[PDB]
């Protein structure tokens, strides 16, 4: 560990190397909301029935002998999927004479280059999976390049509900907005069963969370309370539990049957634009909170699993009409011992069968 500075005939000291690694967020992927649905075909269909027809019975006259009736309805839809083809190559020109960073006179080896390239490929491939999961939770599966692949609200003939919490105004009633959010998910599920409406996930950003906990009603509801929960939420850390991959504990808030979780995930495309995970396409103004609410696995049961991701096979011999996999990795050797080639495929698309449940919450007035 002794080499030169600006003269080849003098020696200096090489203390070591310090590395910075980009942040990687995996909260939504680790939530386990989307159940894997491996597939053999490149597209799938679904039936959307809709009795949706209970009217009240208008009275008749016993002598006249009139009556009523009611028809039904049954429709069908289809679905495409997205394909990703990460590819990278290794040549000896990256090993010939290249010294390992952090050491004085040791050359790099093929094994470490291959390992780091493979690890980079895998992390680059799963961050986009997390991004697509968040996009599906938003209700519109949009590519990182802004290419629409599945407009759930259209494909399903529903409308997205946006709830304006109005956290800046002390006169606003947070209880009413929370109750509206809770009731919308109860009266719009339309499953034929009973809906709790309080098992919902609420994921917000810095602005929404700070404005919510700062609101005088929320603060007052806990200031005059002797429960240990009130003590922890007014004075304590408020970073209760969880791990989004960058921070050891996600910060959560309890104001009834609902839990507000602050999620701050950021990803970049190849053009440099930053894709913040918790955002609403359109509201770019700052000082406005944005959050997304969606059910968990416990709302409708293991039966109805609104959230699922379908995987499809590759266009490679041996993989025709085969159950899809999350990731396919292949290795090929260049001709005349010129190096090694790599590939990484995934034919995937997440979707939500009841997009009307996915609602957005905002911290500004209507």
């Amino acid at each position: 560990l002794t080499n030169s500075e600006k003269s080849r005939f003098f020696l200096a000291d090489l203390t070591g190397e310090v590395q910075s690694i980009p942040n990687t967020y995996g909260y939504i992927s680790g939530l386990g909301l989307f159940r894997s649905a491996p597939q053999t075909q490149t597209t799938f269909l679904m039936d959307l029935t809709d009795w949706d027809i209970s009217l009240l019975d208008a009275v008749d006259r016993t002598s006249r002998k009139a009556e009523t009736s009611a028809p039904e309805r049954v429709r069908q839809i289809s679905f495409p999927m997205m394909y990703f083809k990460e590819v990278e190559s290794i040549t000896p020109d990256e090993i010939q004479g290249v010294r390992q960073p952090g050491t004085a006179n040791e050359l790099t080896t093929e094994a470490v280059v291959r390992a780091k390239k493979l690890m980079k490929i895998r992390t680059k491939f799963d961050i986009t999976r997390e991004f697509l999961f968040m996009q599906a939770l938003k209700g519109k599966v949009i590519d990182a390049n802004g290419v629409l692949y599945a407009d759930l609200y259209k494909q399903f003939d529903v409308t997205k509900k946006t709830i304006y919490f109005d956290l800046d105004n002390p006169n606003s009633d947070i209880d009413a907005h929370i109750e509206d959010l809770r009731m919308h998910m109860e009266d719009e599920a339309k499953t034929g069963t009973v809906i709790n409406g309080e098992e919902i996930h609420i994921v917000v950003d810095r602005t929404f969370f700070s404005k919510l906990i700062k609101h005088p009603k929320i603060r007052d509801a806990y200031l005059a309370q002797q429960t240990p929960l009130a003590w922890q939420q007014i004075t304590g850390s408020l970073r209760t539990g969880g791990t989004d991959g960058v921070q050891a504990h996600m910060n959560r808030f309890y104001y009834g049957g609902v839990v507000f979780v602050q999620y701050n995930g950021k990803f970049k495309d190849k053009r440099g634009k930053t894709h913040t995970l918790v955002s609403i396409d359109g509201v770019s103004d700052t000082n406005v909170g944005v959050g997304h609410a969606f059910p968990n696995v416990a709302m409708l049961g293991e039966a109805n699993n609104i959230f699922e991701v379908a995987y499809a096979p590759c266009p490679k011999m041996g993989y025709a009409n085969t159950l899809g996999q999350e990731l396919y990795v292949f290795e090929y050797e260049k001709d005349r011992d010129e190096g090694i080639d790599f590939e990484a495929h995934s034919y995937m698309l997440p979707y939500c069968t009841r997009p009307q449940l996915l609602v957005d919450v905002r911290s500004d007035a209507e």
């Binding site: 800046d168 002390p170 006169n171 009633d173 005088p216 007052d220 200031l223 005059a224």
Partner: protein, 120 residues
Amino acid sequence: IKAKTYPDFKEFVKDFVANVKAGKRYDFRKYQEAVLPLTYSSPWPESDIPEVTDFNYTPDYTVPFSEELLYSVGAQMRTADFFMDLQYAIINGKDVDTVYCEWLARVKPFSMLNAKLKDS
């Protein structure tokens, strides 16, 4: 405003608004616990409330909620903030008819105080 001069809150706020109408301004959000006696039936104020000469208070929200209400019915705010928002209303031309304190139970940090406003 000398300490314990008014035997209740109702007669305290009657001459608090009158003092404000006369050009006197008050600010006690930093030492709030030292000037508000507990319970609205106790003599007001607990300690003498000093005057101020640099009252420059611009709130972040519309203080006159309606044309006849300082806050929406049921709004909870810091007690010291109520007096500032009330002072903001008299300065801008709103007159106070009745200050809602009949069934209130808390005076310390957060209280549900309201005022019925009028023009001129």
